[PDB]
Amino acid sequence: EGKLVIWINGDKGYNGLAEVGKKFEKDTGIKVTVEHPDKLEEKFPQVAATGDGPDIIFWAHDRFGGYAQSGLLAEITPAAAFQDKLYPFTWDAVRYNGKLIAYPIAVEALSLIYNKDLLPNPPKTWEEIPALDKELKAKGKSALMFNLQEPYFTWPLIAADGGYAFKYAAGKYDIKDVGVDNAGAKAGLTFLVDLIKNKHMNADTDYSIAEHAFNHGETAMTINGPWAWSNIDTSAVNYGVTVLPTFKGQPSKPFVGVLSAGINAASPNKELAKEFLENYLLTDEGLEAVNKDKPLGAVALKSYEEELVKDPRVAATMENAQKGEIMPNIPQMSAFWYAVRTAVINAASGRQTVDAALAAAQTNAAAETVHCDLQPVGPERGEVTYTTSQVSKGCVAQAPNAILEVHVLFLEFPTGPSQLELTLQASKQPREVLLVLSVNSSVFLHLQALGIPLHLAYNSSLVTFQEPPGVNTTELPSFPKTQILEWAAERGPITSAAELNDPQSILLRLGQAQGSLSFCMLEASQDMGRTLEWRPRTPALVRGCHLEGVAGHKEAHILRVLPGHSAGPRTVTVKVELSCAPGDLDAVLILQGPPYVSWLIDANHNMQIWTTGEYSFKIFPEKNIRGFKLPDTPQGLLGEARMLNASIVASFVELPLASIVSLHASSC
């Protein structure tokens, strides 16, 4: 049996996708869990770089470039026939540096959705909207309302009068040539700031606000993609979808997105992911299901698209798309978007001027250029093990006066019989404890519970103990995870809970409840503190690269701790073992972490050190040493390695707050 975790924006047809996952489940017996976290595009890289991540991610192509740039996405190898089943330029959208990284699913382009009843004649130009808003305000309504918090809905104007993100030419993008501070952009954004200043729109309008406004007939117009059409269909609004207005006599040029599906490089189910995506998702019936849940606009599948074009709404999406510009997939897109967002917000709220916000956007957009392409490193080349307190999902709570405390652990391992070492540490002093464990694969378990009045709850068929106990055991019912939590709570309060993926060892300390929290509420990337400390089976996928234009042979090993969710200053231990290392080896260690991380180093040869915060060693342990300010991004750290005259990055890894880490090296 197997599993497929998927991420997709909450505004898309994730239910239909889930149904496709049900067909895939019945056929292959491989369960599919579709989820829609908040800001999943910004969350994915962070977790994927730790080994924990969805098997598949769904998002516009603009981000996949960055993702794979950090070696976070496996290469897609579809047969030429299958590639012929989809349109080329979509593959081009997912192709970056010559490799197909994702499966193009759909095409997305913003369209003007107007209320036919309120506005039978939508405006052809932006310049007339103010007048219309005046009239409709005399009728007790508003002209237009759309999300102003995300710059994706404002770019069509900005680029309408000539704005552009990165000057493209000779098959490649020029990152140092940005067109946000040019005339057209300043003109468009000036027009928007004039709309808000004249109270034709409220600077705080967001997606939900606009959708509610138009769907309830409070505003006569809105700007949205195919997905929103379903929500309008449920509403009593008689809506029309048409081209966007012209600014300064020029058509609005929206950024055309390509909903694509990328495979997590850390996923062991790569084969199965290929199975689902290709053979189930990109078939007529699959895209039929998803589009039934939420319209995908123009799909990348030629057949089903041939059927969808007949929808005049899709046709409009294609007109607006043809008039616009496909988004670049380069990594810098992230920074660009961030900058633009800051600009728009600061200009709409009145914090900054148009010229100022857009100048600053011209400087901030392009930045942290890439220095190399990170590629996975084989185990025999590099190896990492570590012990951390963080968990995929976690909560820690206190139970005053509770005669019985409950602990729940959700474990997930590859499709095979695993081995696990679990040890429960007794607290200082009679409280009886309940341990509910759930697993998605067979497991051989080494349980160690000393002096603990313990009770158990688990699968008698999936779990096999080396030292089994007879009495005080309970068969785990077949419920969803949440219902498992509630069911466990029906016996006693839950003091702690965590979802681990492929753990090697687990240490659970009782009575170590941190702070004052009375209810356990699962939080992604939660810090378990002194409660739980586990060693995962599979570490983050080792990565490395070669820094071009750098003379000599100098090895660079980089370690970057991820944000730690508000904890006191910690000491991270680090052991290094460079096997088959030349007598006089010129290497460097780069330790990046939050400001509250001090480093404790232990190595066996001569090498460079470069850290944040402060660092100490086993030799002369006292007399800590002040660190330096290091770049925060992966490409920033790689660039610092280049500054360190490092020609090769032998190792690159990113972990969360972890007490101990050990690294072994090779490549002789």
């Binding site: 001569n606 090498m607 050190i609 002369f620 007399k623 040493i625």
Partner: protein, 105 residues
């Protein structure tokens, strides 16, 4: 006054090395003290050039000098070097800093 190893505590600031030696502050740098006079001891394992020069000196003390008590083997120490470019270069065995054995040469 047979040649032998004796203690010598060193401070990197006093010698002007605190700039490109950040760690440690002081360390043991045993010196070789004592006279080289024949007969030379079995543990010193004096070189025969030392024996010779000692005897010639005994014959012509004003024209030829004595054999000298010096280190014959050195050991490494872990230190933190500083490059001109400005990197914290840790050398886990920065050789030739402490005396391991003394002899007459």
């Amino acid at each position: 006054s047979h040649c032998q190893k004796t203690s010598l505590r060193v401070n990197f600031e006093d010698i002007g090395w605190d700039s490109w030696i950040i760690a440690p502050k002081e360390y043991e740098a045993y010196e070789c003290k004592g006279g080289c006079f024949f007969p030379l001891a079995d543990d010193v394992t004096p070189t025969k050039h030392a024996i010779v020069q000692t005897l010639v000196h005994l014959k012509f003390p004003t024209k030829v000098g004595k054999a000298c008590c010096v280190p014959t083997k050195l050991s490494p120490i872990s230190v933190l070097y500083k490059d001109d470019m400005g990197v914290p270069t840790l050398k886990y065995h920065y050789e030739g800093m402490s005396v391991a054995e003394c002899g007459c040469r």
